[PDB]
Amino acid sequence: NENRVGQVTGLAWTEVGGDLLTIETACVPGKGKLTYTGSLGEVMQESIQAALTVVRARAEKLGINPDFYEKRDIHVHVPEGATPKDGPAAGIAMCTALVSCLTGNPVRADVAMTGEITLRGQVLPIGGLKEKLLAAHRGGIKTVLIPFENKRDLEEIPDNVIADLDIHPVKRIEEVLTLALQNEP
Amino acid sequence: NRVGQVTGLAWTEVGGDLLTIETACVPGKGKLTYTGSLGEVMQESIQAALTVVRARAEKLGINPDFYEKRDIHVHVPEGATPKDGPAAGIAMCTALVSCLTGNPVRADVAMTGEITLRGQVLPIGGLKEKLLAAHRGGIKTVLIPFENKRDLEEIPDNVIADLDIHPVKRIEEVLTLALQN
Amino acid sequence: RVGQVTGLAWTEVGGDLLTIETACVPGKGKLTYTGSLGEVMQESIQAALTVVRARAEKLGINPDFYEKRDIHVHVPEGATPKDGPAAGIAMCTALVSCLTGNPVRADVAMTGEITLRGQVLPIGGLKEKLLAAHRGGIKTVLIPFENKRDLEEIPDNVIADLDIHPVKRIEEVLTLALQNEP
Amino acid sequence: RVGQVTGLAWTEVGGDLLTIETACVPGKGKLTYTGSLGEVMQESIQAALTVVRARAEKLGINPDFYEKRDIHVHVPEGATPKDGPAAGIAMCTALVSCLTGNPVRADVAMTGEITLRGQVLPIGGLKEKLLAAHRGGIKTVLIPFENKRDLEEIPDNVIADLDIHPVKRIEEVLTLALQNEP
Amino acid sequence: GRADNENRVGQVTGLAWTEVGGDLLTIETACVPGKGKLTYTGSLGEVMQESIQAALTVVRARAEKLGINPDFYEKRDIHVHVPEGATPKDGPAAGIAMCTALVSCLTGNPVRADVAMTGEITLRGQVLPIGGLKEKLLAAHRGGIKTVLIPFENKRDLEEIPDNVIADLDIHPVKRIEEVLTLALQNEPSGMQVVTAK
Amino acid sequence: RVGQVTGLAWTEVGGDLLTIETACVPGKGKLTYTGSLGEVMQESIQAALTVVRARAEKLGINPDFYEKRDIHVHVPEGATPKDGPAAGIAMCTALVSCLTGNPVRADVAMTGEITLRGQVLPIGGLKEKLLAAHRGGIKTVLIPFENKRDLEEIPDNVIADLDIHPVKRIEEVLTLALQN
């Protein structure tokens, strides 16, 4: 269960604003079906497809059998089930959760992350960084990964929050995985 | 018959309410049917519950090929009454496990709680109406999410007195308390 | 009389006499339902089918029928909207009849919601349903046991002419409605 | 003549002459229905197809046809909306013709709703339907048996020119409409 | 010559309705390795989509006579596309053009230069009359189309079309798909050729 | 196994400069397309894919590649509504790149509608597109040949800064945009 379920703390848009989200993924023996649930809007659904494609494209580099998708079913779920969520900001979290699940490489505690993923692996800036970082801070998150191009937004963040968080701006998904996973992918 | 049948407490168009959840599992090719005027959030809770079972199949004594060899139908009468929300999550999981294992559900048990893929039980809303419905249904044991403990403090001690309430944190606790074997 | 059951269920005109048809031809397990059916009525067809699949062997049906038969449930008149769960037991009865070749009694009408456990749950609009049966010249009507008290709000002259069998379970329905002992 | 049947059913302008086409090429069981058909008309095609499957053997049709053939039902003119169940017996006839290579008689028109049991049910707008048939130079029209009474609301001069066959069931239809005996 | 010709395979000028009026349609088809899939694109309305379905069925029913093997056919995916991609197009009037394009694509038989066509297709291969003939023929004339195939039942509608447009266009009224294919394709599509002498 | 090409195409918000991404991963012939795409743009992806499929052999691609690959076309930014046919040639280029492993020049952007016959059709809003290319720091821009007329109304500073190549056909696009 835990073994077959990747778990990542993302920061992304919910109906009442940017918030901490626990992104869960299961990767059970199957035949290649992708399921995704959690009152997800279409942009967020599309971010999951992109995140899965990034992993399929890089399977060999990640030490994953390149034909895993014919022998796995994947379910991405984002509780709370009734709360509407949307937008692309959970993309790097989805990718991280999937890699974790497919490799058995656990996700670090005390880490949250926000950022739009692309098929090429680049991490794109997101909006509402202040709201997101405050949520991480309130939630007792120690380390936050943000898109490199959101560095400019750190200025508007209250000083005390900046001091409490360990903030890593990342350009690419390789950096995200190195920082977020317990072992070296 | 108590196999595959679980009393859930979850939201209905006629108030936060009691749900008689039915499941059937027959030899098939792996098709999943869910019926009973279920809203999208409730349908998703079924998918989540089923994934929990798949992830834990061997530990649960279920053949991990059931997804390929069994057709599963989840149905929630009354057929015309709209039902929705995530609160039947742990009941869906319990019903599925029971159906797949032939392990009957205990009489006079109901449960309410949102399920996650990791198996943690999350708090729900409208606890008072759910327990009221439980009380009128002659339920004796009710499983609720651990975080709904505080909400008990707004509930008539009449109802509290006649119910054996178990706040649960995880799905394993649920299966242990709900199943006969 | 095989694969044909007289049900009483809601239509756009109101609760009415309807002939539920079922065909179970050679195929690979495909379900089709037609007849201007609302989603609640569609779901009742699925529940009815699951009841049969779950009890196939005790019903005298080859348990692996569902990968060697295609099934079409049709409810004329094709253009008249119909909905609700009240044809459930009729759907189940028609499926059993079609799959076993046991003809359905033409003197019998039935109404009732079915559950996967094979319980018969009470319905609404009993008065309008039983008036339709009477006007149709139906002698015997099966109703859900919990609808017995609703009989008191239907004219006694109509009820006096009807042989009413309140039922709790699908086995009672099949016993009363099928020409031959299942 | 093969796979083409003259029907009478509702279009946006009214009940009128429909030419119903079917093709049944080798394939793997794809069903396509075109010609701006409304949902009720689409369901009548499904009902008609099931009637044929249920009687395939008796009609000289191999049972495996739903597995071996792609079937396309098309009703020109393509842009004209059509709906209702009154083309049911024509759909059934067209399918039987196509699947057996038995030519349809071009002097016959037909209207009627079909059931899975192969009964022919009464339809609406019989006057508009027969006027169209008559304006169209049709000599023989098959109508549902229970529409006989509706003939008396239609000008006698129109009815006098028509050879009208009331039918109760599908095998009558096929015998009257197909060139060779089915 | 080789280049121009294969650039005419699966390419047909139809005359049918667009949001910029009854106009010229450049219909394209590609037949590539596949599994029997059909795709159709080009901001097509439902009625036009159905005419493509009917056109394909016509081709399928005549596969033997057209020398298209089922073996080959089920190993192919077909994509019908009608640029410009964003312009809405609808109606049944491109039916015979769709059929011509499909036959061409599947048999590698190049469409003749400077032909356009309009007509509703039926499963029996009949060409049914269309609306807006004038505007369609105006669009063909404006485009320097030399030869236009139209439905036989539309011949009566030619009286509203000016003398010069009738002068510049070689109009062939057609009753059946067989006539359309013979007139539109470079090689005779139906049946082997038998030469007789008196 | 991800191809990437800079396209100029219509968006509801922000600039018209986009990165068209295509992945071609082990699969069984499924097409996925994402990026808040309107229907016309979705269709342009299908057209681009078919162009490649029809020319596979000549492009150095196994003709039956689609049996064993899945293709995902994604157009960031993911939440930006975008539409129109103008990314067509970029989509074609990205697919060829992905399937051959030939990288795309990053200093090149392109705009144009693609047909199945491989012709490049003119597009609208050339001015907004070239401005986005200019602000984006793009050196070279491929535009449809029939759009040349439209260059007359572009700022001279933009004209002076950009290397504009009008193109008529997909083969011209490929030789200009692909590196090797």
Report chain F residues whose CB lies below 8 A from the CB of A91.
Answer: 78
With both helix axes pointing from N to C terminus, report the angle between B40-55 and B89-101 in degrees, rounded to the nearest 10.
50
Residue in D12, D25, D31 to test binding to E, most E beta-carbons within 10 Å? D25
Contact F72 A124 (CB under 8 A): no
* Burial zone of B166 (CB within 10 Å; 0-12 exposed, 13-18 middle, 19+ buried): middle
CATH number of B1-180: 3.30.230.10
* C107 within 8 A of C129, measured Cβ to Cβ: no
Angstrom CA distances, C66 to B34, C62, C80, stand at 18, 9, 29
Determine the Cα–Cα distance for residues D111 and D153; give it in Å rounded to an integer.
17
Experimental resolution (Å):
1.8
Q: Nearest CA to CA, how far is A163 from chain F (Å)?
A: 31
Determine the Cα–Cα distance for residues F35 and F78; give it in Å rounded to an integer.
5
CATH number of E1-198: 3.30.230.10
Determine the Cα–Cα distance for residues A71 and A67; give it in Å rounded to an integer.
7
What CATH class does D1-179 carry? alpha beta
Taking the CA atoms of F109, F115, F120 and F126 in sequence, report the sign of the dihedral they define. negative
Determine the Cα–Cα distance for residues B51 and B72; give it in Å rounded to an integer.
13
**Residues in A lying within 8 Å of F, measured between beta carbons:** 42-43, 46-47, 49-50, 53, 56-57, 66-67, 69-70, 87-88, 91, 116, 118-121, 124
Look-up of token digits 């010559």? E1
- State both tokens at F170: 């997909």
Report chain C residues whose CB lies below 8 A from the CB of B99.
Answer: none
Phi, psi of B61 (to 5 degrees): 70, 25
Contact E47 D21 (CB under 8 A): no
Taking the CA atoms of F136, F138, F142 and F147 in sequence, report the sign of the dihedral they define. positive
**Strand partners for E80:** E29, E40
Angstrom CA distances, D110 to B33, B100, D89, D117, E119, stand at 41, 53, 7, 18, 28
Contact D23 E51 (CB under 8 A): no
Report chain D residues whose CB lies below 8 A from the CB of E50.
Answer: 34-36, 74, 78
Determine the Cα–Cα distance for residues C142 and C58; give it in Å rounded to an integer.
22
Please state whether beta strands B114-115 and F108-110 pair in parallel, antiparallel, or not at all (unpaired).
Answer: unpaired
Region of residue B15 (phi > 0: left; psi between -120 and 50: alpha; otherwise: beta): left
Region of residue E108 (phi > 0: left; psi between -120 and 50: alpha; otherwise: beta): left
E123 → closest Cβ in D26, D72, D77? D72
Determine the Cα–Cα distance for residues E155 and A133; give it in Å rounded to an integer.
74
Cis previous bond, F77, omega within 30: yes
**Residue A163 contacts by C-beta under 8 Å, 6 or more apart in sequence?**
none
H or E stretch including E28?
strand E21-33
H or E stretch including A92?
helix A91-103
- State both tokens at E4: 């121009």
- State both tokens at D133: 């048939």
Q: How many CB pairs under 8 A join D and E?
A: 52
Determine the Cα–Cα distance for residues D54 and C32; give it in Å rounded to an integer.
14
Q: Is A89 helix (H, G, I), strand (E, B) or coil?
A: coil
3-class SS shares of chain E: helix, strand, coil, % to 5: 40, 30, 35
CA-based R_g, chain F, Å? 15
Determine the Cα–Cα distance for residues A173 and A183; give it in Å rounded to an integer.
15
Angstrom CA distances, E147 to A11, B90, E185, stand at 64, 72, 13
Determine the Cα–Cα distance for residues A129 and A152; give it in Å rounded to an integer.
10
**Strand partners for B21:** B6
- State both tokens at C44: 């009742």
Determine the Cα–Cα distance for residues F173 and A105; give it in Å rounded to an integer.
43
**Residue B157 contacts by C-beta under 8 Å, 6 or more apart in sequence?**
none
Contact B1 C117 (CB under 8 A): yes
- State both tokens at F124: 């609208």
Q: Which of D151, D95, D163 is nearest to D123 (CA)?
A: D151
**Residue C40 contacts by C-beta under 8 Å, 6 or more apart in sequence?**
B37, B79, B80, C83, C84, C85
Q: Tell me which DSSP letter residue E48 carries.
A: H
CATH fold of the domain at A1-182: Ribosomal Protein S5; domain 2 (3.30.230)
Q: Which of B161, B141, B181, B167 is nearest to B60 (CA)?
A: B181
DSSP D18-72: EEEEEEEEESSS-EEEESSB-HHHHHHHHHHHHHHHHTTTTTT--TTHHHHEEEE
* D53 within 8 A of D66, measured Cβ to Cβ: yes
The single-letter code of the amino acid at D29 is G
Look-up of token digits 């008249």? C80
Report chain F residues whose CB lies below 8 A from the CB of E110.
Answer: none
* F119 within 8 A of F141, measured Cβ to Cβ: no
Q: Which of D175, D169, D160 is nearest to D130 (CA)?
A: D160
Determine the Cα–Cα distance for residues F28 and C92; give it in Å rounded to an integer.
40
Q: CA nearest F5 in A: which residue?
A: A120
Determine the Cα–Cα distance for residues D112 and D92; give it in Å rounded to an integer.
11
**Residue F81 contacts by C-beta under 8 Å, 6 or more apart in sequence?**
F11, F12, F13, F36, F38
- State both tokens at A46: 């599309």
Q: Nearest CA to CA, how far is D35 from chain E (Å)?
A: 7
Q: Is E169 helix (H, G, I), strand (E, B) or coil?
A: coil
* D70 within 8 A of D25, measured Cβ to Cβ: yes
Angstrom CA distances, A84 to A88, B16, F133, stand at 14, 20, 36
Report chain B residues whose CB lies below 8 A from the CB of A79.
Answer: 114, 116, 122
Determine the Cα–Cα distance for residues F159 and F149; give it in Å rounded to an integer.
13
The single-letter code of the amino acid at D99 is L
Look-up of token digits 């009940």? D15
Determine the Cα–Cα distance for residues D69 and D50; give it in Å rounded to an integer.
15
Phi, psi of F25 (to 5 degrees): -110, 160
- State both tokens at C83: 């909905």
Cis previous bond, D77, omega within 30: yes
**Strand partners for F74:** F21, F34
**Residue C81 contacts by C-beta under 8 Å, 6 or more apart in sequence?**
C11, C12, C36, C38
Look-up of token digits 């008309």? D41
Q: Tell me which DSSP letter residue C145 carries.
A: G
DSSP chain B: --TTEEEEEEEESSSEEEEEEEEEEEESSS-EEEESSB-HHHHHHHHHHHHHHHHTTTTTT--TTHHHHEEEEEE-SSTTS-EESSTTHHHHHHHHHHHHHT-PBPTTEEE--EE-TT-BEEP-S-HHHHHHHHHHTT--EEEEEGGGTGGGGGS-HHHHHH-EEEEESBHHHHHHHHB--
End-to-end CA distance of chain D: 15
Q: CA nearest E130 in D: which residue?
A: D77
* B3 within 8 A of C117, measured Cβ to Cβ: no
Phi, psi of F52 (to 5 degrees): -65, -45
Q: How many CB pairs under 8 A join C and D?
A: 57
Q: Which of F114, F118, F172 is nearest to F142 (CA)?
A: F172
Cis previous bond, A80, omega within 30: yes
* D144 within 8 A of D169, measured Cβ to Cβ: no
Q: Nearest CA to CA, how far is D44 from chain C (Å)?
A: 7
End-to-end CA distance of chain B: 15
